[PDB]
């Protein structure tokens, strides 16, 4: 679905803001 | 998962949290 | 230089596009 | 790590292969 | 509610870019 | 607001301009 | 500079983020 | 049709990033 | 065309090929 | 050639706002 | 202000918070 | 090319709709 293949890069860019050093996960 | 739960609603900064390495 | 902060931001997105559905572990540090 | 290598020198969507969890 | 916030991520790149050094006024409201 | 008023339809460059502080 | 243009547009995505229904402005002088 | 415009952004980045070198065509609908 | 062919059903790295102008 | 490589990314996203329907052609070299 | 304070070294959540409009 | 001319100093609205395929 491109509905949440688009959220999902707005997710992951969160994700970077959001965790600085300590990184992430990204699990879909 | 985080789709399921940040497509469908807005997740705050807590809910991202969530999903750091830390 | 290279910001680096900066550059991270465009790794992930690019790791997104990439990684598909096995998704990334990004560790900066 | 992936910041060292890729922001350094542009990396290849192969190199980037290289950091994804398949 | 998702949809607007996605919508909005891509309005203030827009307003960046069309305002330049003016800068520029967001208000979700 | 700017969110009703451009995200349900593409707003023009004009009603972009609306919201810069020039 | 390009570099500040460049940093600017990651600025105000993450303000977007950041400051919800707050919303920003974004006054670069 | 904010939908199309919105694929469309993320388009045009993931083609820059498997493009290359080749660079690439947008055309939309 | 590319939106067409990607904006409902994802189109892969593969597919997206197809749009590059080498 | 990091940094032209960062640039190029917000270039095709300006060109995408910027050129509308008629789409473009990005030709890095 | 925020191009000084934030393009020259990471800004946290915590020090653009003081930009918004609250 | 759009690089040499738009990665240095800053490219005004105008100087990008130069290289759109109208
Ligand atoms: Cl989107
Ligand atoms: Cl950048
Ligand atoms: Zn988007
Ligand atoms: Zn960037």
Do not use: K, M, R
């Not at chain 1, 509905?3 to 996960?25: D, M, P, T």
């Amino acid at each position: 679905f491109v509905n949440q293949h688009l959220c999902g890069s707005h997710l992951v860019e969160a994700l970077y803001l959001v965790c600085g050093e300590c990184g992430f996960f990204y699990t879909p | 998962g985080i789709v399921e739960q940040c497509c469908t609603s807005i997740c705050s900064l807590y809910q991202l949290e969530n999903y750091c390495n830390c």
